[PDB]
Write an enzyme that holds these catalytic residues in place. Structure first.
Site, PDB file in Angstrom:
ATOM      1  N   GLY A  36       0.823  -1.199   0.000  1.00  4.01           N
ATOM      2  CA  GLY A  36       0.000   0.000   0.000  1.00  4.01           C
ATOM      3  C   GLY A  36       0.853   1.243   0.000  1.00  4.01           C
ATOM      4  CD  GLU A  63       7.738   2.569   0.476  1.00  2.00           C
ATOM      5  OE1 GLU A  63       8.040   1.448   0.008  1.00  2.00           O
ATOM      6  OE2 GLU A  63       8.244   3.641   0.071  1.00  2.00           O
ATOM      7  CG  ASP A  92     -11.010   6.354   7.055  1.00  2.00           C
ATOM      8  OD1 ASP A  92     -12.090   6.640   6.460  1.00  2.00           O
ATOM      9  OD2 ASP A  92      -9.921   6.357   6.495  1.00  2.00           O
TER      10      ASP A  92
HETATM   11  C1  LIG Z   1      -3.106  -6.207  -5.218  1.00  2.00           C
HETATM   12  C2  LIG Z   1      -2.119  -5.036  -5.254  1.00  2.00           C
HETATM   13  C3  LIG Z   1      -2.351  -4.035  -4.128  1.00  2.00           C
HETATM   14  C4  LIG Z   1      -1.456  -4.277  -2.911  1.00  2.00           C
HETATM   15  C5  LIG Z   1      -1.038  -5.729  -2.760  1.00  2.00           C
HETATM   16  N1  LIG Z   1      -2.064  -6.764  -2.514  1.00  2.00           N
HETATM   17  C6  LIG Z   1      -3.200  -6.500  -1.627  1.00  2.00           C
HETATM   18  C7  LIG Z   1      -2.804  -6.556  -0.173  1.00  2.00           C
HETATM   19  C8  LIG Z   1      -2.430  -7.757   0.417  1.00  2.00           C
HETATM   20  C9  LIG Z   1      -2.060  -7.816   1.750  1.00  2.00           C
HETATM   21  C10 LIG Z   1      -2.050  -6.660   2.530  1.00  2.00           C
HETATM   22  C11 LIG Z   1      -2.419  -5.449   1.952  1.00  2.00           C
HETATM   23  C12 LIG Z   1      -2.797  -5.411   0.614  1.00  2.00           C
HETATM   24  C13 LIG Z   1      -2.279  -4.341   2.953  1.00  2.00           C
HETATM   25  C14 LIG Z   1      -1.823  -5.017   4.178  1.00  2.00           C
HETATM   26  C15 LIG Z   1      -1.568  -4.880   5.526  1.00  2.00           C
HETATM   27  C16 LIG Z   1      -1.618  -3.668   6.374  1.00  2.00           C
HETATM   28  C17 LIG Z   1      -1.414  -3.745   7.751  1.00  2.00           C
HETATM   29  C18 LIG Z   1      -1.533  -2.619   8.546  1.00  2.00           C
HETATM   30  C19 LIG Z   1      -1.816  -1.374   7.981  1.00  2.00           C
HETATM   31  C20 LIG Z   1      -1.900  -0.148   8.829  1.00  2.00           C
HETATM   32  O1  LIG Z   1      -1.829  -0.191  10.064  1.00  2.00           O
HETATM   33  O2  LIG Z   1      -2.086   0.957   8.166  1.00  2.00           O
HETATM   34  C21 LIG Z   1      -1.988  -1.292   6.602  1.00  2.00           C
HETATM   35  C22 LIG Z   1      -1.904  -2.425   5.814  1.00  2.00           C
HETATM   36  N2  LIG Z   1      -1.306  -6.120   6.001  1.00  2.00           N
HETATM   37  N3  LIG Z   1      -1.370  -7.072   5.033  1.00  2.00           N
HETATM   38  C23 LIG Z   1      -1.694  -6.405   3.917  1.00  2.00           C
HETATM   39  C24 LIG Z   1      -0.234  -6.183  -3.973  1.00  2.00           C
HETATM   40  C25 LIG Z   1      -0.662  -5.485  -5.271  1.00  2.00           C
END
Ligand SMILES: C[C@H]1CC[C@@H](NCc2ccc3c(c2)Cc2c(-c4ccc(C(=O)O)cc4)n[nH]c2-3)CC1
EC number: 2.7.11.1
Length: 270
Positions: free
Chosen positions: A14, A19, A120
């Site tokens: 993300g 990032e 959110d």
């Molecule tokens: C599909 C496209 C978009 C991003 C990716 N796959 C989707 C995906 C797969 C696994 C994920 C996340 C997104 C986001 C995320 C998080 C995460 C944890 C904590 C936060 C936070 O605290 O902001 C944000 C995101 N953990 N595992 C994942 C690869 C390319």
């Protein structure tokens, strides 16, 4: 054990805002998500994350500061975002949405129970693990609404307009919990109809006025069965004091309707 503190950043998960990188442990191959923040706001986010421990909330493993940059070690949810499970203009099978809605309520009950409001809630922020277990993520806008058993009323305008409760646009102050209940109802609407009902909950918004006038023969409501629609009628109530509470959501007919079989388990015959 040497090198066990080493993580390789292998994939962008993300972006925005820094990032989120997929990190793989050099030794164990354990996968975690590392949130890289270039970089007061992050201090609060880390502090709230340190309070969290629930199966429907993204796990916080710790943090490291390398000068100006903050590294937050968080749960990797291989299933990705709930958002990508929503087919545009369709949604998803009603039993899947009910299971996701139950897991979302469990997470929100937990957070409200420890005095935290997410602020959110949306499908972009609801992640799925390897078993499609929902986890509430991203505590960047989260805040404490109850401390020493005293509730503090909120006044800060935040969230995402299609998911925000109407009181955030009409009132100077508001209770935190009905705001998160509202955003969950919009997530439920998206899951069952694959579309958002309005750009924002204001009278100037025709789709919002139609809903208040009970024009459920229109989209998205026409795509939703009468049992989940009866719950949405109780959640998407403009007056936050009249809006259904989570303990009452747990008593709702659709919420308690048997719909979803457990995960497919290996079986043989004869
Ligand atoms: C599909 C496209 C978009 C991003 C990716 N796959 C989707 C995906 C797969 C696994 C994920 C996340 C997104 C986001 C995320 C998080 C995460 C944890 C904590 C936060 C936070 O605290 O902001 C944000 C995101 N953990 N595992 C994942 C690869 C390319």
């Amino acid at each position: 054990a040497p090198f066990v503190e080493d993580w390789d950043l292998v994939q962008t998960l993300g972006e925005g805002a820094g990032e989120v990188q997929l990190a793989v442990n050099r030794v164990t191959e354990e996968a975690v998500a590392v949130k890289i923040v270039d970089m007061e706001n992050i201090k609060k986010e880390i502090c709230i994350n340190k309070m969290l421990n629930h199966e429907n909330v993204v796990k916080f493993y710790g943090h490291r500061r390398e000068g100006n940059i903050q590294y937050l070690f968080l749960e990797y949810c291989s299933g990705g975002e709930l958002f990508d499970r929503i087919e545009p203009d369709i949604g998803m099978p009603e039993p899947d949405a009910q299971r996701f809605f139950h897991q979302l309520m469990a997470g929100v009950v937990y957070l409200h129970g420890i005095g935290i409001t997410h602020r959110d809630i949306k499908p972009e922020n609801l992640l799925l693990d390897e078993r499609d277990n929902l986890k509430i993520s991203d505590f960047g806008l989260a805040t404490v609404f109850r401390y020493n058993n005293r509730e503090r009323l909120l006044n800060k305008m935040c969230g995402t307009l299609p998911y925000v409760a109407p009181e955030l646009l009409k009132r100077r102050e508001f209770h935190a919990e009905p705001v998160d209940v509202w955003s969950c109802g919009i997530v439920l609407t998206a899951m069952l109809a694959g579309e958002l009902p309005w750009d924002q909950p204001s009278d100037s918004c025709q789709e919002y006025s139609d809903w208040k006038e009970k024009k459920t023969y229109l989209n998205p409501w026409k795509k939703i069965d009468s049992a989940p629609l009866a719950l949405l009628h109780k959640i998407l109530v403009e007056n936050p004091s009249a809006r259904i509470t989570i303990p009452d959501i747990k008593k709702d007919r659709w919420y308690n309707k048997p719909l979803k079989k457990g995960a497919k388990r290996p079986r043989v015959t004869s």
